[PDB]
Amino acid sequence: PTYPKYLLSPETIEALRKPTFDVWLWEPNEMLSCLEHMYHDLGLVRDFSINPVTLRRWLFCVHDNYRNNPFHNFRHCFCVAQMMYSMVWLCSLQEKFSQTDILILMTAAICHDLDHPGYNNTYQINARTELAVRYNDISPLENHHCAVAFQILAEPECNIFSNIPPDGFKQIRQGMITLILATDMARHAEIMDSFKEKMENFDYSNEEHMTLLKMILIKCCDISNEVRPMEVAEPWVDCLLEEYFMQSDREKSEGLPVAPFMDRDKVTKATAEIGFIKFVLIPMFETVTKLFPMVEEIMLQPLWESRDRYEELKRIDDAMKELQK
């Protein structure tokens, strides 16, 4: 007949594999179904004996632990997971990685921003919040996302790892913690340098090389909005700035230092993306392309287009600003 929303149509299930997927057309229950589909489709439910009902409860519990922030919310979560899922197909990751690595990449993508408060690590540290005190200024937000991830998995009803032997659990936990902690942008240059070093002679059988590759993969998915079609990416930037401005305003009326890139009076959407696309995004996907050449046409290309559109927007933007001076 005419099936209900939570029942993904074959058209949707097909599109879910490409980075062109419109993440905005869906409501939470439909996104939860997409994530569910991903675990069955990638063979994770099968190879790890994940109880299908538990998988659902777990996703629902994960959803309940994401906050209603303009950016760091459940829909961003779904974006990272969906981009990771696309990466698996685009790069044929299942010929390079074991199912355990895939489970690690996917579960970490879904759990990487759990219970994000809407204010970054710099604010946590400068404001001496309880999280900064708890984690001693060492990537407090990411450490917290992990802890929540495993407190959730500790609940028997949500433990998608119930049937994995203990050695496997430990191996998965270690991998997830490493990936989630790697998303902290403060460590971006460090992680990039290490990867590029290993990239001089990449060894798919070297465990230390794969760890760095997985860290890069989840980092790519975490800040991959600009790779998506313009109509899908555009709104995310506004959501991010809304969050950044909120923090800068708070930092100003609290006497805490304010980062220029979050300063309402110094940053423009255009100048912001241009620099981020040319000095963070493109260089990263550029090195990843050396390993997976198909990545250039599917992701480096839309980044070049995005860079050019924002450079045009910057002209008009600066013009408008002159009239207001």
Ligand X SMILES: CC(C)Cn1c(=O)n(C)c(=O)c2nc[nH]c21
Chain contacts with Zn ion (rule: CB under 5 A): 113, 222
Q: Which of 37, 40, 63, 72 is the catalytic position?
A: 72
49 torsion bin: left (phi>0), alpha (psi -120 to 50), beta (else): left
Stretch that binds ligand X, among 155-163, 176-184, 272-280, 283-291 (CB under 6 A): 272-280
What is the distance between the terminal CA atoms of the chain, rounded to a whole angstrom?
60
**Between residues 170 and 266, which has the closer beta carbon with respect to ligand X?**
266
CB of 141 to Mg ion, least distance (A): 6
Residue facing Mg ion at closest CB distance: 113
C-alpha 52/C-alpha 229 separation (Å) is 33
**Is-contact 126 85, C-beta < 8 A?**
no
Find, among 263, 281, 293, the residue nearest to 225 by Cα. 281
CB of 47 to ligand X, least distance (A): 32
**Is-contact 90 295, C-beta < 8 A?**
yes
Question: Could you tell which of a copy of itself, Zn ion, ligand X, none binds residue 113, using a CB distance below 5 to 8 A set by kind?
Answer: Zn ion
Within 185-204, the residues that bind ligand X by CB under 6 A are 185
C-alpha 290/C-alpha 93 separation (Å) is 15
CB of 112 to Mg ion, least distance (A): 6
Is residue 112 annotated as a catalytic residue, yes or no? no
- Single-letter amino acid code for the residue at 27: E
DSSP string for 280-301: IIHHHHHHHHTT-THHIIIIIH
Phi first, then psi: give them for residue 16, nearest 5 degrees. -55, -20
Stretch that binds ligand X, among 140-148, 209-217, 271-279, 287-295 (CB under 6 A): 271-279
Question: Could you tell which of ligand X, Zn ion, Mg ion, none binds residue 272, using a CB distance below 5 to 8 A set by kind?
Answer: ligand X
Within 139-168, the residues that bind a copy of itself by CB under 8 A are 156-157
**Between residues 54 and 306, which has the closer beta carbon with respect to ligand X?**
306
225 binds ligand X (CB under 6 A): yes
Query: Which residues does the annotation mark as catalytic?
Result: 72
